[PDB]
Every structure is written in C-alpha cells, then in structure tokens.
Design an enzyme around this catalytic site. Sequence first.
Site, PDB file in Angstrom:
ATOM      1  N   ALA A 153      11.175 -55.879  60.246  1.00 29.75           N
ATOM      2  CA  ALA A 153       9.961 -55.956  59.486  1.00 29.75           C
ATOM      3  C   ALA A 153       8.951 -56.859  60.142  1.00 29.75           C
ATOM      4  CB  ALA A 153      10.207 -56.453  58.052  1.00 29.75           C
ATOM      5  N   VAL A 159       8.780 -58.050  63.456  1.00 28.57           N
ATOM      6  CA  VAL A 159       8.259 -57.725  64.762  1.00 28.57           C
ATOM      7  C   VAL A 159       7.480 -56.446  64.721  1.00 28.57           C
ATOM      8  CG1 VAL A 159       9.883 -58.889  66.198  1.00 28.57           C
ATOM      9  CG2 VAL A 159      10.350 -56.531  65.347  1.00 28.57           C
ATOM     10  N   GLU A 212       6.882 -53.539  66.385  1.00 27.90           N
ATOM     11  CA  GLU A 212       7.546 -52.932  67.508  1.00 27.90           C
ATOM     12  C   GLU A 212       6.601 -52.234  68.449  1.00 27.90           C
ATOM     13  OE1 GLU A 212       8.617 -52.539  64.485  1.00 27.90           O
ATOM     14  OE2 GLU A 212      10.373 -53.889  64.590  1.00 27.90           O
ATOM     15  N   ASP A 268     -20.913 -63.677  97.520  1.00 28.19           N
ATOM     16  CA  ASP A 268     -21.282 -63.573  98.900  1.00 28.19           C
ATOM     17  C   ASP A 268     -22.619 -62.883  98.884  1.00 28.19           C
ATOM     18  OD1 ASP A 268     -21.164 -63.640 101.705  1.00 28.19           O
ATOM     19  OD2 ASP A 268     -20.630 -61.479 101.721  1.00 28.19           O
ATOM     20  N   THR A 293     -24.234 -61.130 101.976  1.00 25.21           N
ATOM     21  CA  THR A 293     -24.451 -59.991 102.834  1.00 25.21           C
ATOM     22  C   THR A 293     -23.433 -58.929 102.595  1.00 25.21           C
ATOM     23  OG1 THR A 293     -25.418 -61.294 104.599  1.00 25.21           O
ATOM     24  CG2 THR A 293     -24.659 -59.049 105.116  1.00 25.21           C
ATOM     25  N   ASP A 347     -17.600 -58.760 100.393  1.00 29.07           N
ATOM     26  CA  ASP A 347     -17.288 -57.670 101.291  1.00 29.07           C
ATOM     27  C   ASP A 347     -16.533 -58.009 102.549  1.00 29.07           C
ATOM     28  OD1 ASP A 347     -19.533 -59.031 102.141  1.00 29.07           O
ATOM     29  OD2 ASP A 347     -20.125 -57.331 103.442  1.00 29.07           O
ATOM     30  N   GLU A 380       5.823 -48.155  62.660  1.00 25.57           N
ATOM     31  CA  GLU A 380       5.375 -48.900  63.803  1.00 25.57           C
ATOM     32  C   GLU A 380       5.413 -48.067  65.037  1.00 25.57           C
ATOM     33  OE1 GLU A 380       3.919 -51.360  64.097  1.00 25.57           O
ATOM     34  OE2 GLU A 380       4.319 -52.806  62.456  1.00 25.57           O
TER      35      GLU A 380
END
Lengths: 246, 993
Positions: free
Chosen positions: B299, B301, B303, B345, B347, B686, B780
């Site tokens: 009950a 957990v 599932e 970066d 370029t 890149d 569940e």
Amino acid sequence: RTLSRWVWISLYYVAFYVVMSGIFALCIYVLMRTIDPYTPDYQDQLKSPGVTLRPDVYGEKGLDISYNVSDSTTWAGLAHTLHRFLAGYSPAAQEGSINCTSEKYFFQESFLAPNHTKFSCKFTADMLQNCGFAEGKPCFIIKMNRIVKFLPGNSTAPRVDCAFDGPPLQVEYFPANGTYSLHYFPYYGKKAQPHYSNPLVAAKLLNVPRNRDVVIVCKILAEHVSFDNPHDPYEGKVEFKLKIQK
Amino acid sequence: LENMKKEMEINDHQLSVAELEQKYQTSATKGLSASLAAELLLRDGPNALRPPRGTPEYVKFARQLAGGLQCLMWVAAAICLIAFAIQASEGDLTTDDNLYLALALIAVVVVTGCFGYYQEFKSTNIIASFKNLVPQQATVIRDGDKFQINADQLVVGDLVEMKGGDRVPADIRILQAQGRKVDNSSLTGESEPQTRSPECTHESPLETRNIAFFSTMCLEGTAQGLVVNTGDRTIIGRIASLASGVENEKTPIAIEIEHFVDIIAGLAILFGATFFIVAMCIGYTFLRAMVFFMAIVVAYVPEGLLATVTVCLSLTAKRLASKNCVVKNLEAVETLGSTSVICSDKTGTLTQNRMTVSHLWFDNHIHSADTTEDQSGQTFDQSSETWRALCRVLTLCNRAAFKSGQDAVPVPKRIVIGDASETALLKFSELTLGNAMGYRERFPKVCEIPFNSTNKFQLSIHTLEDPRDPRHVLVMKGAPERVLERCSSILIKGQELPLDEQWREAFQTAYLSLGGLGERVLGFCQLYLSEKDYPPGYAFDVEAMNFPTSGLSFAGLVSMIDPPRATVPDAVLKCRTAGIRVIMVTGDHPITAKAIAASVGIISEGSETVEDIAARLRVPVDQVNRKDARACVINGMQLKDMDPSELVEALRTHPEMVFARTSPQQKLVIVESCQRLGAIVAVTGDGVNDSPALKKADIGVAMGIAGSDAAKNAADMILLDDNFASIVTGVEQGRLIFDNLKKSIAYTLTKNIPELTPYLIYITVSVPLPLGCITILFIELCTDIFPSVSLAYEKAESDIMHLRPRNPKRDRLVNEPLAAYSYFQIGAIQSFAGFTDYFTAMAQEGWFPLLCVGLRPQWENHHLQDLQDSYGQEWTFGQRLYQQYTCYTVFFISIEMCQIADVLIRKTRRLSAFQQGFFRNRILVIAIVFQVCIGCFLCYCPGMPNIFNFMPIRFQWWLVPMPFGLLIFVYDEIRKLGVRCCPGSWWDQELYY
C-alpha cells in the site's frame, strides 16, 4: 515542522476530517435508508442453499471428525458444538410457537410488520432419535441454510442422502417424519420471525469399519438446489471425513 | 589529486639549446644512443597514455535493486515466502497466494530495476576519441642517423624531426626549424598556423615559438627538437588525464528522486512497524502479523511511480529530438531546466566561426559592410565612383579563387583556395559587384608581384578593360602605413587630389579606430600609368622595379570580421530573463571577445569595465573603484596569477564577465569557481579546448555541426542543428518536467491512501478486508499508469521563462505541501469513497454495516459454512468470499472513479481547469478512456476472478464513488480559486505543490 502555526494544522483537520467523516456517514445513512428492514436487496449469492453441520470441522468436517472411541477426550471437542446446536431446540425454549405435522408450505402472509411475530413451527429434538452423544460411530446433524421467502422442495420433503461404491458404512437418518419438512418454509426472516427453528436432520454412521478415512458426502436434492464444489463445497452438500481411529 | 592538473604548467623554453641538452643527456646533432634511449625507456616508461578503470554493467543494474522502494518490495517479497514457508510446514495450505504474491513482487523489483537502469545510463567513450587522434610512429635521430620508430619508444632527450602533415609525437624543444608552422588548436581552439622557431618568444611557454606540443600537428615546413616530456607528462597528456580524472557527477533530478524515496520510505517504515506492533497488542498471531505487514508495504510503496518518471522523461526527450536536440542521458532532460549559470565558448558556439569583411575607409568616411551569413543587413554605398575603384583593386589585386562546383552554395559559404584575407576580399566583391571572374577576365593581368615578407605589399598590372584606352593599370595592397608612404593623391569621390596633412591625419584616425575594433586592416591604392611612357607592347619586369612604386593614388582602406549566430543574441537575453547568468569563456583575444560580448548581450549597454571608466574619466585605473564596474574582461595571462579566492571575488563582484585568452584548464577553473559558489552550471562549446570544462559542467552542451569529436564526447547533450535557441528550450523543458513531475507524483501518491486505509480498518474494526494486495497492484501497475504519464503533456500554467532558476536546496520535487494535499486532503476523500462502495455491496447482500464489526474471525473461518447475516440467512464460506471479492473489485473501481477527478485536478497547480482547459491534453483524455476500459475488462472478462479475484460489478456499483469524485473536483477548484485570489500565503504556502 513549524511553530506557532501547528494550531493552524490541528484546527484544520479537526473540522476537515470532521467534514469528511460527516459526509462519509452522510452517505452510509442515505444508503441504509433505501433497504427493507426485513429482506436484503440481493438474494442471488445466497440463492442455492448451503448445507452445514454441527460437528465443528477440523477440516472438511461435518464429520471430518477423526477421533478415538477408546479415548474420552478425543470426542469431547465435537460434543461441545453438538450440544450447542441441539440446546437451541429445547422444549423449554418453545412455548408459544405452533405445533405442526409433515406437510405443505405455510404462508403467514407478506413480509410485513402489520402482523405480529410470524408463528414458527415447533421442532422437537426428540424427533431426532438416538441422537453425551455417539461415543462411537458419530451421529452428525445436518441443516439447510435459511433463506427468506425461499421454498425448497416439491412433494412432501426434500431428501438428504449421504454417500461415499465406496467402502462400507451404514447410513441411518433421523428426521422428524421424513427429511426436511416443507411446513417449515418459507422463512420470514429474523425480524419477522425471532425464535424460528429450522428443521434438522440427524444422520448416524453406525459403520462396521474402523481405522480408515471415509469420505462421506451428504447431498440434498431439489429443483432449487444446485451444487458447485468446484468452489464452495458447502453448496447443498457436505464433505465429512470420519475416522474412528481406535 | 586532479588538483595538481588544474594548475598551469612550467617549462624549459628559457634554457639555451646546449643547456637543454645537459638536463636531457642528449646530443643536438647526433641524437641519443640506441642504448641510452632504451635505458630511458625503462626508466621513464612508454610514451603513451593509460586510461583509467571503469565499472561493469552487471553491478550497475544490481545497484538499482537497492533503490529504497526496491528494498521495501524485497522485504515484502521475502515476507511472502516466509509466511508461505511457515504455512507449508504447519498445515498443508493448498492456496498459492503468498508464494505467488512473492513471485510477483520480485518481478516488480526486477522490472523497476530496468527502468531506473535505463534512466541512469552513461554513454561515455572519451578515451576512445582521443585514441583516434594518435598517429603511429615518429622519426628520431639516433647515432647520427634518422630512423622511424614506434612513437611509444620515444623518450625524453632524443632528437625528433617533424615536417608538414605529421603529428607532434611529444612535447618538444625546438632546436632548429625552417618555415615551420603548427596548428595549436588543441590548446587554443584556434586553427591558424603558428610559426615554430628555436628562438624563445615569450615567458609563457604556451605562447612561445620554441616549444611544440603533443596533440598538435605540423602544418608546413620542417623542424627538429628535443623531447622534454612524454606520455602523461606532456601538457595535453595531463589534460587528457584531468578530463578522464574528473567524476561524472550526479544529476539534480536524480537527487530529487532519492529525496522523495526517503520521505515515502520513511512513512512506509513508520506505518509498517507502527501497525505491526499495534496488531500484536491486539493479539494477532505472528502468522497474521506478517501478512498485514506485506499489505502495508504494498500500500505504501507506489510501485508504478519510478517507471512513470522514466517514461515522462523519455517522452520529453522525444519532443526535443524533433527539435534536433539529441539527449544522450535521460536525466539531462531536466538539468538544463535547473541551470543557474552558463559558461559559453565564443567561437563556433556563440559565433558562426566564419571570417568575413568588416568595414572600408574611403571618401574620408567609415563604411560598414554586412558581416552576416544570410546578409540580413543593408548596403553601405553603391554610388561613389571611389567605391568602384576600390572594388577593382580588391578583385584584381587578388589571387584567391572559388573552388569549382560551388555555384549551388551561397557566396559566403563556399570554399575558397587562398589565404583568409584574400578570400574575404573575394567574397566581398563577388557579393556587391557580381562575378569577380568577370572582372579578372576584363582586365587581364600581365605582371604581378606577389605579397612579399619584405615588401609587405602586393602589386599587379592589368590591361584596362576600357576599350577607349585599354592601357595598363597598376594596383597594389598591403600594410596601411606602407601603402600610405607610396601615395601622392587620394581618389576623393571620383576626382583625385593631393594628399594633405589633413587627409593623412584622417587616415590615421580611421586606421586606429578600425584596429581598435580588433579588425585586420589593409591599404589599397592604384596608379594609371602614362600611356606615352608605356606602350601596349611594353614589358614589365617583376624582379626589378621596371615601373614606379611611388606617387600612387590611395583609394581606401578595408578592415575584416566574423559574427554571432542569428539566434544567439535573443537566446542570451532569454537566458538572462530566466535569471541565468551568462559568462563568456574563450581562447580568443580580448578585443574580439569583448566586442561579441556586447553584440550577444553578455555585456549590456552602459555597463563598464574598470578600464573603460578610466578612459572616460581620463583618470588612472588605480584611481577607479572596482566596485563601480559591473562588467569585467580578464585576460588569461592575468588569470594565471590569480588565486581561486581572487577568482571567487571576481565572480561575486561582476554581473557581466568575459574570460578571454583562456587555456583549457582555465576554463575548467572558471567552471569550478562558479560551482564553488553553489551554482548549477552549464557549459556550451565546440572545441577540444572545451573538453575539460564540458566534463566538469553539471551539464555540457556541444555543437553538433561545428563541434569537434572530443567536445561531443565530453558533453551531455548535442545540438545537431547548432541552434543556440535550443538552450532556451532545454531550460524550459527541464522546468516543465519538474512542474509536470510534481503533478504526476501527487497523482500517483494520492491513490496510496485508499490502499492504506482499508488495511488499517481491517485491524482496528475487525471487518472483512475491503481491498486486497493483488488489487493494489492493479491500480499502481495497471490503471494509474497511463494517466500519470499523461501529465507530462501538460502545458505551462504561467511564463516559466519569467521565473528565476529553482533553488536546488529550497525547492524540491516533493515537499511537505505535496504530502499534505495528496495524503491528507484528496487521498482521504478517495478512501471514504472506497469504503462507501464497500458498505453498499455488503449491505445489498444482506450484511448491514452495523453487523460487520468484529465479524472477520467468523468471516475468515473456513470451517464455518453458516455465517449469519443481518437478515438471518446463512452463508457458506465460498459464497461470502465472492461478495468479499466483489467488494475488492468495486473498491478498486471506486479508486478509478475518484482518480478521474484527481487526474483533472492534478492537471494544474495554480490555474483552473476552465482557464487551462481540462481538455487540450489528448493523452490525458486517452488515459481516462483506457483506464476505465481496463477496469471494466478486469471486472467483466471471464477467468479474471480466478487469477486476479475480480468479480463482475452491477451497473449501480460503478456509481457509488461518483459523489466523492465530484467533491474532489469542486474542493480542489475552490482551493485554487483561493490561491489565485490572494497570493498572500495561507492556502498557497500550505497546499501549493
């Protein structure tokens, strides 16, 4: 985990779980209103009547009662239940009901309050002859499950024949002029008929044999009766394994 | 520790050639002896890189099995077997529940393991990509003879030779070289060839000419050098180790998952044990006490939940795939939606990485050309006759040519054979002028002097296209100053005029300004040779100055440039609105870096650096309070000096930061510094120079088209299209997932209560069990799944981009407000609806609610075929059971019915269903239809009562929970109405997920 705010939590649920119990109960009480205080809305399930016996079953009893004739203590357990049921059909208990004979169905009228307690048929334990109880070769008692407004049968009475083919035993039946007498039906219900007594059918297994498990099934026949056993082994029949291990 | 690797390296470039030999025990001419080289090989070890150790998949799968819920599920599975074992010995129980339930539970754990395993994936083959670079062997001089040897055989001290086309086998100290140029893009990220010579150019070894590095290659020329470092010891080899060394880390989403598991697990254990004891006090035998416990575990957990999360993530990933955004790791789908700082970066990331013309100076005016690839800009000047004159020189005075077969592609896109400068000029004229080839056809080139190192100019003589006077025209280009010395007159407008001081001064101003822009400037001039002096036959001597070089007419200046990707400026602003700080980290020079920063919006208008304040004020830099400057530009050379605490200060102190001329390690340092602050950081890049930073980043994103293989291996995500906009989408997607995950989680959790409560009542009340263990799994695992998943589809309730990034510490995926609503409010309502139908079924059958209390001992007793109902009827064992099972089925259906409202409410945290529309989500509606279909199928299909114990339900039975389902919808609607009406606090703080 807060502080000086828990009062804002406790008080919340107090009158929220409050509101919800209040609604839940609210809906039970409406539902309850729409049912007859003398007859359930659905009878199907119960429909095929079950057959139950006095001897408390160790497992598949009604006579899955293995005991030793030589021993006093061995039978005592079954005797308690046996006495318990029979105690009910005492004569002291029955004062005011009505005397009958083996016959047809009796109709008290509709399932209505306007009449007083519907008079039930008297049943004497005396009818069950020869049956502490059988120390050896037990005398099991059979019963048909009560079902309101149900008329089992045809002819005078609904038969009960127990059977093993199958090794020796001697069947003897004690049933108040018959098997199950029809005059007992229909059952008005506990509300309508309080100290109502259902017909009993004593069965005695005098069987000559000993020291072996005998599977004895007692069956009731009728148009109304049906059997499963692929599920409820109880449906209109018994499963008892008697063993007089001495 | 890697910490050592984070620091800048120290080298031997300062030493003289001879001194270098002493350290190495080597010969400059002869090279090492065969024996000596072998000796060093054993000493030092091979010239190779050794990757680190990894982990197996088997272990990886198993680790998941211990995911809290899995643990509880395990205890349940085992407990099932335990009860079964006790049973098998004591009394022969034909039943197979426990044993089977045990089997089923174990299966749930394994399958769940697969889901988490799938989510947990790490596809990494970084070392493999590096291995791809490796060459084969290298030429060395030993015993005065050159021979090729296995590269691993190379040791410090031997004499190595390299030529154009070869990869540098190891770090080398350049002893001699001839025209050698090298590509040090591995270190810088910049491909332009760098000359290598024996002379020591600079204090920083990274900068100096005399050192050549492993992981780079010789572009042209030849060179010889002495090996200073080998294997792991090399500069790049260390970077390799560092990249390999850095931990993968844990995704934030993962952390959130574990957090709620502990919460749910905690409640599970508390209630589990709390009731275990409560039962014992009650007088329940251990045989039973355990059975209740198993029910409690099932009950408590959820599932289905972990799997739902994985599916929701996968679905989100699929949408992104359509975007040209590929997600290697499912968790990365969120990360983005949690980034606080982006280190980018320049370029190839922010920029297109495609050179191009900048502006021109003619007619004493600065004109700006259109740098953009698509050419989204406007024209600077068609009309001036001066332009045509300048245009002619740019075309004529140019060697470059387009590759054939280019016609399909756009002019700026096409490949050109020639130097960058000439290609830029060629593309510039071709665009505005039309076919350059035509101009070259019209003016045939008789003689030319190619650009000379000494001359610093390039000259060409052509036959004037004009038929009136097809005579010879002279054109030349070169260093602006040099061209100036050469000119007498200036073509102003169409007419020429003497070059007075005033114009000359303007030239300097124009020249300085363009240079300030970080642009390369060239001078252009021409001269119309006198006809009498030069006959049509007249031969021109290239080698000897046959014709006049001076007194020429100066036409104009031209400068160069590159550009941000179209999407980039917009994307940057969006990230900023999101509250994400954007920092630039680049290998490139500061002038260029700062200019782009302004272009993209990294540096907003009006923001100033200490240097710019000093210039404006015309005061010393020392005089300026640094606090005054929000923006900062830090050169790598300076960065090297600074301690990390100092770096921390810079990060805290400035909102707009540019780190320029950074090395790869320094990029890593910047990233770490940001992280030290406690910020979640994303890196975009890149190049190979991005690799360490990308690895370290919480999430690294690499450019797909432009990106180098190494960068791609280093990254978590790849932008296949190079669409920078995807970052904005990515951030939004993660946030949406978090928002939708909460909805899905609350939805899943809410149903836990109706599963829990029946078990509790069962013990306290002693009533027949309202709902079974198997039935729970049907919810569940079966019914709830599609609906829970469908929440992933939900659109944003508000402007997500508008809000700040989530505080990983403060804002959690599952918090107390979620539990209160799911467990306390709605789940409670659902539990009652379940019970109500339970009562209705029993009552209709003949067992009124009053009678039920304390009945279970008789009810459960297999022996008693005659249990009496309220009516006085007697029921067999099996018959009553059917009713009981039917109760389980209706209770089950009631959960489904209540879940319908819950699904609708879970749709929106703040907004009303009317506003959001409980309707656009197609998947959600599908979920409702399928969930109902499944429930009906489970009840109606024949044979299901045997396996699942589901029984057919009467039409009326379906209706029982309807009133409860409706209350939930109204209740949640009213609640949310309150939240929106008053943003103040009470409803919001408590309930708002």
